């Protein structure tokens, strides 16, 4: 009956930010104290909630979104931000009620020669809506000529590899992000901290 936060945080490999994973958390008691009382997280920003109280509230549903981005891009995982990640990969809403948790994962997600697993979307015509997920690999038409599914000039693959190398500057190293959003609806609450 304890929420499977370890399945999310301690997962062996994370998803690419363009294809971010979402785990629905329900029918469990949370025990957020394992998270906020850890020295491993370089980022623990909460919005609309106080992290200390978290073991004394209930929410009707909890979502845990996880992905990997650059260290310099963690600042974009926040309400009202812009940039490649917030515009084309993962968009938080302005009234986001939840917490953003990030930590350096250079030891796990970087390979000598470059880790070409983790991708981000570079080309898109419009910004994503909040919590929108776009996994299309359609060739991006940058000019007036149609692409017909063939890469070329003015016709680019929309995804790019980070190529995480262990010797990158810290801002260029991979960071694992977990975004908890807390739902409050007119329905029974099925996620609660231990105290309540």
């Amino acid at each position, epitope marked *: 009956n304890l929420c499977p936060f370890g399945e999310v945080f301690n997962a062996t490999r994370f998803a690419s930010v363009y294809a971010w994973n979402r785990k629905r958390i329900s029918n469990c008691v949370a025990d957020y104290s394992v998270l906020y009382n850890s020295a491993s997280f370089s980022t623990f920003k909460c919005y609309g909630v106080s992290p200390t109280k978290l073991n004394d509230l209930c929410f009707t549903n909890v979502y845990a979104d996880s992905f990997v981005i650059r260290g310099d891009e963690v600042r974009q995982i926040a309400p009202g931000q*812009t*940039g490649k990640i917030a515009d084309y990969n993962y968009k938080l809403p302005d009234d986001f009620t939840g917490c953003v948790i990030a930590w350096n994962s250079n030891n796990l997600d970087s390979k000598v020669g470059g880790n070409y697993n983790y991708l981000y979307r570079l080309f898109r015509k419009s910004n994503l809506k909040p919590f929108e997920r776009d996994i299309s690999t359609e060739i*991006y038409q940058a*000019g007036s000529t149609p692409c017909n599914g063939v890469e070329g*000039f003015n016709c680019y693959f929309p995804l790019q590899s980070y190529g995480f190398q262990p010797t990158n*500057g810290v*801002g*260029y190293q991979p960071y694992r992000v977990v975004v908890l959003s807390f739902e409050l609806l007119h329905a029974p609450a099925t996620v609660c901290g231990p105290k309540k």
Partner: antibody
Amino acid sequence: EVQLVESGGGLVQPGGSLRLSCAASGITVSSNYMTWVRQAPGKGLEWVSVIYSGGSTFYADSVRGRFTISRDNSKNTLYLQMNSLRAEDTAVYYCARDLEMAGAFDIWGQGTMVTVSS
Amino acid sequence: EIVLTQSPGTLSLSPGERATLSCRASQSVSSSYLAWYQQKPGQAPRLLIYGASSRATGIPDRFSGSGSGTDFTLTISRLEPEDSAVYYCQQYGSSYTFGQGTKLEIKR
């Protein structure tokens, strides 16, 4: 044939305003990262601003709050609105298409001269 | 910010020789975000290399870029008179900054 044709350069008194245009052909401005890059007489290149296809904009520290990058899809034209111009804004300004990791600044305009002087 | 310093400031080499131009960053950049441009007199900059080692369209194999971390190099073998220009390095990962330039003069 891919072409960026710029216009709007001229003489302004300090504190005055100017607006540059970059008419594109062979490139859909609204679908690209579009940048302005300037070069003061005798010096190197300095990035000015960028506008994303989705509409996000970013500016260099030396021009933020005074410059505004924008576009008009119907004319396929990039714009740079310059306000509160100072003598150090005197430069040849270039518009460039930006492909980032897929190719950097691959297409450049011919440039227009901007002179801020009393 | 990331500051790119190019060395040397001026080069004077004979045709057919090889030119080695350096770009040094104040902090390490991913090679995926480095670029080299050539600017001939009275002309707009022309992209030579993107991503450290990748040649732009129409750029001959005579130009080759390399480097990692804080150090990147542009090499122009078999120099010709029309290689006389100013060469700029650029990074576009953390914002966008350019180097001051290296002016290549071709001897005769």
